[PDB]
Amino acid sequence: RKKRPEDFKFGKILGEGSFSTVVLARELATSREYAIKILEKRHIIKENKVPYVTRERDVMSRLDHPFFVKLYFCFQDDEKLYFGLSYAKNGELLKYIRKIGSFDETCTRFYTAEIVSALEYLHGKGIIHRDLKPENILLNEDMHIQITDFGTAKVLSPESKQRANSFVGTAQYVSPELLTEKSACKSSDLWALGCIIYQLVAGLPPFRAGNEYLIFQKIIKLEYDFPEKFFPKARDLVEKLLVLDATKRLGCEEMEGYGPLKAHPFFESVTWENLHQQTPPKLT
Ligand SMILES: *SCCNC(=O)c1c(C)oc2ccccc12
Ligand SMILES: [Cl-]
């Protein structure tokens, strides 16, 4: 049959959006924990964004991978919509970056590789995330990544692939092409990847300033710098991702795809087929 709010005990808030919350929920019957995404219909109705919410729901129902959140169930209330998602016990990657300052090389390689492997799967389904960043990369009980927040995700097509883009994600991770021509492709997610790797090694994202206009100006100029203490092979990797021309980013279709990305020297040691079974290095 169907589930109702009364079937659950609602605990701590795991996430806070403007129009939404994610709450830790225990299903009383089974005692299984879920992260439940709760949407107020009022806001969705009022902004005429129903098609967008269904899009999120559908995109998520296509995900069956260890590195991605899973949609288990959906039910409905008088004033609220509920999505039951996998619960990532250890919270946001950002929390760990903040706690230890920056990742050592072992940890950088390991988590970058999970992210790259996650992206190859996602993109292989014609799906782009569009808001990739450390706060949307969670860690599960086993400290593997769980990529989440599919509210901005889009299914791509070859006609789509190339100037209508509706959504501009978080300023620090946005690619130049989203800003200037309102294009959004797989490559734009690869730009975000480069920002994230840089952030893991350096402790903070590459493009930084006192407001979003100033951050955008740095992005479109490619105005950023590596600190002296930056793993050389990660720097080469980052330099091959943070490239203004979207068709020249390591990993995009035009650069012969994921093969060359996974074959970058920073990933020499990585065994790509068994990642989700490896015990992750301790974060220190
Ligand atoms: S829980 C069944 C999945 N339902 C929806 O996604 C849904 C329906 C039928 O009506 C909606 C209105 C607003 C948001 C989501 C909605
Ligand atoms: Cl392998």
Which CATH number is 30's domain given? Answer: 3.30.200.20
In a shared domain, residues 64 and 106: no
- Among 47, 53, 150, the mutation site with the greatest number of ligand 1 atoms within 8 A of its Cβ is 53
Residue at which a domain ends, from 56, 76, 91 = 91
Name the nearest CA neighbour of 114 among 65, 169, 70, 64: 65
| Cβ contact 12:29 at 8 Å | no
- In terms of Cβ atoms closer than 10 Å to its own Cβ (0-12, 13-18, 19+), residue 166 is exposed
Q: What is the DSSP letter of 8?
A: E
In a shared domain, residues 58 and 150: no
Q: What is the DSSP letter of 248?
A: G
Residue at which a domain ends, from 66, 91, 116 = 91
Residue at which a domain ends, from 39, 71, 91 = 91
Which DSSP helix (H) or strand (E) runs through 109?
A: helix 105-123
Strands 127-128 and 33-40 come out as: unpaired
What tokens appear for 156 in the block? Answer: 């791509």
Question: Which residues lie near ion ligand 2 (Cβ < 5 Å)?
Answer: 271, 273
| Residue 131: active-site member | yes
Name the nearest CA neighbour of 202 among 222, 224, 226: 226
Name the nearest CA neighbour of 165 among 64, 39, 156: 156
| Block residue for tokens 């797989």 | 186
In a shared domain, residues 120 and 66: no
- Point out the ligand 1 atom lying closest to the alpha carbon of residue 54: 6
Measure 270 CA to ligand 2 centroid, in angstroms: 7
**Specified resolution (Å):** 2.2
In a shared domain, residues 118 and 188: yes
Active-site residue identified among 131, 189, 236, 245: 131
Strands 71-76 and 154-155 come out as: unpaired
Strands (E) located in 117-209: 127-128, 137-139, 145-147, 154-155
Q: Give the residues across from 21 on adjacent strands.
A: 16, 38
Q: What is the DSSP letter of 31?
A: -
In a shared domain, residues 251 and 172: yes
Q: What is the DSSP letter of 68?
A: B
61 lines ligand 1 (CB under 6 A): no
C-alpha 46 chain-centroid distance: 28
Cα–Cα dist 82/40, whole Å: 9
Domain that holds residue 20: 1-91
Strands (E) located in 77-147: 80-85, 91-92, 127-128, 137-139, 145-147
